[PDB]
Amino acid sequence: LELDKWAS
Amino acid sequence: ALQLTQSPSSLSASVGDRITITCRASQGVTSALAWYRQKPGSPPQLLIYDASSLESGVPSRFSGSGSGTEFTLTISTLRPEDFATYYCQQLHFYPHTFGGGTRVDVRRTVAAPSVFIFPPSDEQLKSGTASVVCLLNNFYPREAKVQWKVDNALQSGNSQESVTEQDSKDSTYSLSSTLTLSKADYEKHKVYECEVTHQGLSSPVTKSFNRGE
Amino acid sequence: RITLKESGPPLVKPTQTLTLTCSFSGFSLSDFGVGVGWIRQPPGKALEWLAIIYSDDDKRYSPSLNTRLTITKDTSKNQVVLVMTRVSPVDTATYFCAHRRGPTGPVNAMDVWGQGITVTISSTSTKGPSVFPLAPGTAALGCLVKDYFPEPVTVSWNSGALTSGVHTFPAVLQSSGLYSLSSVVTVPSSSLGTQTYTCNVNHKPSNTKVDKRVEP
């Protein structure tokens, strides 16, 4: 599942 | 993808009540979860962002907590404007998922529906089809089940229904179900029956009529 | 502050392409990290995420609709466009575009939403309704307003003189692509032989007006 643009 | 489960899906309460609803995620979404309130006919409105931060302008009665896979939204004291549908959304993974929503309505004593069945009209009958409708009037709670039977055969796939909004004065719901048949089929059967299952009915109610009688 | 408004066609034919536009003000697509998303809601259903596009132009679509969706942005117009191909009746819903703050923590939410534009997918043409009677100490009677397009229709009883006991239900979009709704009113049995009941139906879209007297 890919992480949101700001998850990092 | 990521499954967000909201519960309870439907909730009954009164002004001044304290309620807490939940949103469960199948995978951890850290704190990236938002809560919205949506009133009928209006777009969603942000209440809580990042799981626990009160959105500027939102009343202090609203609060959120949780992290990872568990989240809650609490309304310290229910107001009239809060009887609406609430949704949670996680923005940690793509796609951004919304929960199925929690429906908060006005609580009142249980009220069984008044049921009536209407045979199709002779005028409609020559247009080539027959619409027979069943009315469930002024009941509470909202959950109700209608089952159509023609000559005791359970009907499926040939009916549609719609429910009204909770009444502002008596807090009840009413439901309308329409069974649609071709005229030919209508003419080759006799008993038309509408069976209603509802909490306020100790046993399902059946309203029926015999075509041409 | 920030406001957004969806625009496009309210009616689309099955198979065709649905093009939606989100116009906004109070922010620009050149502010850092800012996003604009699209969310839809079928009648009486839950919200469904569709897609999102950002300032730097990356975008994401819902996995199930991604060979059918295309999101773009024109920054001199301050608009975002969503294109959905081969629509079908199940795509009938209200479409909302919303704003997502960029990093200044609170990027975790769609903070401002448009009012939404409701789009109906049907292959039918304007068509007035046929009005049928729904007939019989409390009694119920009504009118079945069937096969009309497009919404809406107005129903009153006794030219507005009768209001309490009335329940006009939400219309249902049938498999034929045409609408059907019922309006009922509950009245005293004893009134059935001395009081008259007439439902007044008006479907402006087709200039169709009908007054239907209902009896046992």
Side-chain angles (χ1 to χ4, degrees), chain A residues 2-6, chain C residues 33 56 58 60 100:
Chain A
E2 43 171 333
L3 294 166
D4 177 63
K5 178 170 237 226
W6 313 122
Chain C
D56 58 8
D58 58 316
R60 294 294 195 287
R100 185 189 190 189

Coordinates of all heavy atoms in Angstrom, one line a residue, chain A residues 2-6, chain C residues 33 56 58 60 100:
Chain A
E2 N 0.7 2.2 -0.9 CA 1.6 3.3 -0.8 C 1.2 4.4 0.2 O 0.0 4.7 0.3 CB 1.9 3.9 -2.2 CG 0.8 4.0 -3.1 CD 1.2 4.8 -4.3 OE1 2.1 5.6 -4.2 OE2 0.6 4.6 -5.4
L3 N 2.3 4.9 0.8 CA 2.2 6.0 1.8 C 1.8 7.3 1.1 O 2.2 7.6 0.0 CB 3.5 6.1 2.5 CG 3.8 4.9 3.3 CD1 5.3 4.9 3.7 CD2 3.0 4.8 4.6
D4 N 1.1 8.1 1.9 CA 0.6 9.4 1.5 C 1.9 10.3 1.2 O 3.0 10.0 1.8 CB -0.3 10.0 2.6 CG -0.7 11.4 2.3 OD1 -1.4 11.6 1.2 OD2 -0.3 12.3 3.0
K5 N 1.7 11.3 0.4 CA 2.8 12.3 0.1 C 3.4 12.8 1.4 O 4.6 13.2 1.4 CB 2.2 13.4 -0.7 CG 3.2 14.4 -1.1 CD 2.6 15.3 -2.1 CE 3.4 15.4 -3.4 NZ 3.6 16.8 -3.8
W6 N 2.7 13.0 2.5 CA 3.3 13.5 3.7 C 3.5 12.5 4.8 O 3.8 12.9 5.9 CB 2.3 14.6 4.2 CG 1.9 15.6 3.2 CD1 0.6 15.8 2.8 CD2 2.7 16.4 2.3 NE1 0.6 16.8 1.8 CE2 1.9 17.1 1.4 CE3 4.1 16.5 2.2 CZ2 2.4 18.0 0.4 CZ3 4.6 17.4 1.2 CH2 3.8 18.1 0.4
Chain C
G33 N 2.9 22.2 -1.6 CA 2.2 21.0 -1.1 C 0.7 20.9 -1.2 O 0.1 19.9 -0.9
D56 N 2.7 20.4 -7.1 CA 3.9 19.9 -7.9 C 3.4 19.0 -9.0 O 4.3 18.3 -9.7 CB 4.9 19.3 -7.0 CG 4.4 18.1 -6.3 OD1 3.2 17.7 -6.5 OD2 5.1 17.6 -5.4
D58 N 1.9 15.9 -8.8 CA 1.7 14.4 -8.8 C 0.2 14.2 -8.4 O -0.5 15.1 -7.9 CB 2.6 13.6 -7.9 CG 2.6 14.1 -6.4 OD1 2.6 15.3 -6.2 OD2 2.6 13.2 -5.5
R60 N -3.0 11.0 -7.8 CA -3.3 9.6 -7.4 C -4.8 9.3 -7.7 O -5.6 10.2 -7.5 CB -3.0 9.3 -6.0 CG -1.5 9.4 -5.6 CD -0.7 8.3 -6.3 NE 0.7 8.2 -5.7 CZ 1.6 9.1 -5.9 NH1 1.5 10.1 -6.6 NH2 2.8 8.9 -5.3
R100 N -6.9 20.5 0.3 CA -6.0 19.8 1.3 C -4.8 20.7 1.5 O -4.0 21.0 0.6 CB -5.5 18.5 0.8 CG -4.7 17.8 1.9 CD -4.0 16.5 1.4 NE -3.5 15.7 2.6 CZ -2.7 14.7 2.5 NH1 -2.3 14.2 1.3 NH2 -2.3 14.1 3.6

